[PDB]
């Protein structure tokens, strides 16, 4: 697996372990598991790009230890 950080805009890093083939949808489920935020309410942004649920981390060229930002959709 690969370690990524999911960082709130307020600056909290949430460490998540992912498989590099995990869909972004699956990443959100992992975030739900740790933080209790329903995936429907999550937006993940990597270097300014809104990440689509059907893509993988590898689609976004994300490296181990890199940061995806998490934004709430109320």
């Amino acid at each position: 697996s690969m370690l990524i950080k999911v960082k709130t805009l307020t600056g909290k890093e949430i460490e998540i372990d992912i498989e590099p083939t995990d869909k972004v949808e699956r990443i959100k489920e992992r975030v739900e598991e740790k933080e209790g935020i329903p995936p429907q309410q999550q937006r993940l942004i990597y270097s300014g790009k809104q990440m689509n649920d059907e893509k993988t981390a590898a689609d976004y060229k994300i490296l181990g230890g890199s940061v995806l930002h998490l934004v709430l959709a109320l």
């Binding site: 805009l9 600056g11 909290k12 270097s47 934004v71």
Partner: protein
Amino acid sequence: IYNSFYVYCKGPCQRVQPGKLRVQCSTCRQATLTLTQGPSCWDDVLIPNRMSGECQSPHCPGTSAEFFFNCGAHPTSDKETSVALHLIATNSRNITCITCTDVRSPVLVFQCNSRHVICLDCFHLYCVTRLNDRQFVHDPQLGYSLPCVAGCPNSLIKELHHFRILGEEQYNRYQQYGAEECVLQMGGVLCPRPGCGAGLLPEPDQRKVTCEGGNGLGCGFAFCRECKEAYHEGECVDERAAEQARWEAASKETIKKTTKPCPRCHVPVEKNGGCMHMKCPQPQCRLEWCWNCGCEWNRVCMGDHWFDV
């Protein structure tokens, strides 16, 4: 040593380093794939399964290459990869920097029509100033980036890892600012409380936005989405320097050799684009040799400079 390739090593090095190119069979994942022709350009190594070869491992029908880069500075594992920064070149053409006017190496070559050249030190300064001034460009498809310093169109950097030139903390600020801009692009709002930093997509038909989120996601400040105050009742480059700094257009005073005799049989062989791996087509010869070094082809030339720009 001639190095064609650069990576960002975020591991021991924490800097732009010369990279080592390796190739494997995409079927068996072993370094047993003989390419029909070597890579001649970045697309050849960045677009997976683009290149044809024959695998030498017993009974493997693999015919497609996958390339990887490792940092060249240290013994690495094959799986300890680094990101290739494909805009960065060794300044083999001695082209001056668009901003400082000095000949330096390495350089970054933008993908504008002019192929404008900036030294990496000036590139760092460009990124830092644009970042601090909030003049990075947010693009809904490409993310948060910058174009050619000259302002040339269609020149936004696509491989965002180039921004690792900022250094770790500035790069973190880069990604943070990119997230904020993405939020705003998406029709969201940024919390205006000093030091909060939250951004969110508020509910549709309400002027009152609250910075929601337990466990630190929000701060609970209620603001007006119009004026961003507390929620309230009622109404609220040098022209010549740029010319000289062109990777192709400013290199024509120097003759470009396109053909060299095979060192063994002495018969002229045509170079294929930027590929350094020369293969003599004479059936009784078939010498493979490095255009750059002149030596028999080998893995050092492969790893260091299989092709160049």
